[PDB]
């Protein structure tokens, strides 16, 4: 595992040498290939190195980050085009990636938290540094302060577990089952925030709408998963307490998913709409996760991988349109099929994946969470039908409205799509399908 870490560390100096922007991604893509060869993992931890291991769960999430963090560099070519502190920008991602790799590769719960939040600050610099609109302040704080407010109490819950278990290592924790009501709320309300839950999602539409394209990728790509990944490790020893209060979370997320889907239909901003679509699906992920069944756990792991690639993908396309039309509102963006017809194909495939269209990896995960939820209670069929219905209602509205109609009138002349953009879109979607072939690996982490 140290092979990855020391590779990244020695790539830090590449931020300082000039005319090395493009030589960075290749080193970032090549390491993904090298990491892609060392899959021999199992449910239990493997490749121990001083505190760094990796199981099938951590592997897929790590590999997802390397892929996504590599696409960030492709997407944010404008930073290179205007030399807008590109060297500092590169160092932000290389640091950020290292924090993620450690976070998932950490074997002890305290470490996971140590790099859990620490990744936030590199993200926070990203929003303020390279965001256009003035609201990146008022969205910079929300991201920082919702997270800190609920992560600091989690730190107490972590330490209280040493004095009982005597250690942080995940395997040793699973041997215990705790009965204290507050402790349950000090290790899940901290992750329920970052999922996010419907009622505490108020930061998500602000952070995503204002953050740059690259920040949108990682915020939607890996930050929403750290909440999901964290839960998968800490419901193991909260099984008893999970049964007394699960019905509160399931109802909120399920009803939260439906209500947000209606909110999606009344949006008029591409960035906002995609961001609210994240809350909709993340409600199903959390819902199935708390069902605790074998299906709900394997499925939740799957959907987190698939959704991140998609929602990250859809943020590419919004940036492409915004870069030229200059406005992210739906009213400006119309009939793009008649300006950039080649682009509209990628709009569809990424859009179709978001609505659980086949043969994507997204449908495999969504079939499963749906199974666990139904088994949990037949009453869940009511909204789970509504949520899947409306989860396509806004996706069509997102795609159709922005691509189909007659062209805008005031738009000034702008460049057409470039090869970089097409290559970026392929790398987002094409794995999202081929992964179905080897779901063997990225599914059975239990």
């Amino acid at each position: 595992m140290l092979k990855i870490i020391f590779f990244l560390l020695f790539l830090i100096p590449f931020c300082f040498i000039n005319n090395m922007y493009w030589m960075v991604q290749i080193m970032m893509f090549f390491i993904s290939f090298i990491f892609l060869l060392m899959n021999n993992f199992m449910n239990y931890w493997s490749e121990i190195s001083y505190f760094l291991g990796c199981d099938m769960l951590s592997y897929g999430l790590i590999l997802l980050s390397l892929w996504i963090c590599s696409l960030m560099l492709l997407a944010s070519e404008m930073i290179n085009k205007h030399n807008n502190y590109k060297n500092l920008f590169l160092l932000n991602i290389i640091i950020l990636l290292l924090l993620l790799i450690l976070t998932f590769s950490s074997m002890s719960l305290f470490m996971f938290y140590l790099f859990f939040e620490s990744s936030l600050i590199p993200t926070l610099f990203l929003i303020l540094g390279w965001g256009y609109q003035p609201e990146r302040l008022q969205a910079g704080l929300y991201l920082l302060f919702y997270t800190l407010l609920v992560s600091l109490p989690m730190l107490i819950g972590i330490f209280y577990l040493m004095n009982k278990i005597g250690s942080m290592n995940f395997y040793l924790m699973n041997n215990f089952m705790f009965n204290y009501d507050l402790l349950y709320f000090c290790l899940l309300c901290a992750f329920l925030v970052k999922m996010p839950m419907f009622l505490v999602h108020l930061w998500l539409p602000k952070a995503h709408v204002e953050a740059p394209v690259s920040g949108s990728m990682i915020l939607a790509g890996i930050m929403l998963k750290l909440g999901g990944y964290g839960m998968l490790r800490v419901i193991s020893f909260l099984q008893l307490m999970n049964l007394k209060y699960s019905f509160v979370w399931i109802s909120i997320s399920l009803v939260g998913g439906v209500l947000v889907s209606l909110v999606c239909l009344r949006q008029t901003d591409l960035k906002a709409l995609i961001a609210y679509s994240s809350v909709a699906h993340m409600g199903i992920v959390l819902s199935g996760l708390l069902t605790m069944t074998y299906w709900g756990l394997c499925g939740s792991y799957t959907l987190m991988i698939a959704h991140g690639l998609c929602s990250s993908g859809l943020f590419c396309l919004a940036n492409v349109s915004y870069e030229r039309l200059g406005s992210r509102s739906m009213l400006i963006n119309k009939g793009l099929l008649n300006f950039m017809p080649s682009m509209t194909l990628w709009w569809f495939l990424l859009s179709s994946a978001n609505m659980a269209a086949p043969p994507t990896l997204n449908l495999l995960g969504e079939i499963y969470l749906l199974n666990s939820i139904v088994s949990w209670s037949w009453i869940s069929m009511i909204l789970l039908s509504f949520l899947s219905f409306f989860s396509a209602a806004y996706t069509l509205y997102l795609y159709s409205f922005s691509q189909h109609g007659k062209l805008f009138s005031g738009v000034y002349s702008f460049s057409s799509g470039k090869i970089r953009e097409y290559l970026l879109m392929l790398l987002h979607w094409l794995p999202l399908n081929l992964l179905i072939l080897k779901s063997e690996s990225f599914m059975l982490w239990l």
């Binding site: 610099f125 540094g129 600091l152 107490i156």
Partner: protein
């Protein structure tokens, strides 16, 4: 120690005064050291070029005189009834001693004088007040073992220290309210141990030692001046301000390690409720630190243009850059430190 040979003396006599207090095996001996310390600070603090400075020399004097006076009052009373420097079972007479010491250090309920005297101090004066003057008072409180009185000061310290600081724009006055909060953490760390407190104090002084220099080297006294401040490399200015985050105790930086060890011990001692109020209130403290970072994290500003150049002192800056480097990368050296185990 900036102007004349005389300033050199007053600094040393301050060290001797503090040492006499914390090395004294009786209340009366301890009280003497406070008097030595009192007159060592005032001449350092009084300068007649400023109408404000002499006012600062006053508020401190009246407060400290009253504190030592009431401190001696109770100490005489304490050993009038027990006939020992120590009280077998803590009672009201020991509470009175605690009240004076808190006022001597400007804890929450009696902090009012402390920010209100920070208007008219040079930065180097504030550092002596913020860090060193809090040694002798807080170190004697370790002897007294009242919980509720000490506990109340912590709860009010973090609250008043934070909420008050949101409204300020003067950095000297802002740091005062920031220092009141860190004071709250000490007293919390003081009811559990001292070795944590000794560790936590050293880190607190370290960070304040850094932030004071950056303002002192570039003579900044107001928030607006930060935006108007000129630096060659906006990357450099961006990195210097990343010390505030450490002062906010964010884990990627060195400044969290102190906060971290204070939680691993408070939690070990079952003081869960306290940590909730403290750590939660630290966010508000973390807030106005970010308001300073508005001048760095955004990194293209509208700035006045009659300056192209930075004029800075070498030795202070030379020592400041070294201290800043650890303030950002000091975490991986926790392996070396062996004072927590």
């Amino acid at each position: 120690m900036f102007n004349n040979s005389s300033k050199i003396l007053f600094i040393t006599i301050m060290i001797i005064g503090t040492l006499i207090t914390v090395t004294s095996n009786s209340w009366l001996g301890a009280w003497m050291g406070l008097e030595i310390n009192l007159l060592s600070f005032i001449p350092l603090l009084s300068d007649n070029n400023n109408l404000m400075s002499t006012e600062a020399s006053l508020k401190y004097f009246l407060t400290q005189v009253l504190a030592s006076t009431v401190l001696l009052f109770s100490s005489i009373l304490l050993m009038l009834k027990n006939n020992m420097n120590n009280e077998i079972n803590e009672s009201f007479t020991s509470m009175i001693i605690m009240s004076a010491l808190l006022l001597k250090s400007g804890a929450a309920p009696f902090h009012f004088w402390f920010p209100n005297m920070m208007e008219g101090l040079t930065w180097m004066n504030a550092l002596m007040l913020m860090t060193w003057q809090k040694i002798a008072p807080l170190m004697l409180i370790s002897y007294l073992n009242i919980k509720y009185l000490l506990l109340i000061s912590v709860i009010l310290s973090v609250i008043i220290g934070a909420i008050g600081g949101l409204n300020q724009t003067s950095l000297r006055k802002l740091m005062a309210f920031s220092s009141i909060n860190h004071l709250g953490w000490m007293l919390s760390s003081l009811m559990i141990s001292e070795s944590i407190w000794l560790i936590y104090f050293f880190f607190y002084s370290f960070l304040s030692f850094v932030l004071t220099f950056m303002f002192n080297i570039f003579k900044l006294f107001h928030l607006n001046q930060l935006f108007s401040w000129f630096v060659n490399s906006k990357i450099l200015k961006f990195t210097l301000f990343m010390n505030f985050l450490s002062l906010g105790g964010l884990p990627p930086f060195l400044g969290f390690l102190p906060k971290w060890l204070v939680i691993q011990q408070l939690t070990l001692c079952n003081q869960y409720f306290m940590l909730t109020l403290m750590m939660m209130s630290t966010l508000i403290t973390l807030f106005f630190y970010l308001r300073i970072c508005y001048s760095a994290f955004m990194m293209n500003y509208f700035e006045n243009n009659w300056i192209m150049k930075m004029n800075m002192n070498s030795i202070n800056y030379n020592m400041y850059m070294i201290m800043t480097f650890f303030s950002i990368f000091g975490l991986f050296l926790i392996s070396l430190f062996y004072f927590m185990f």
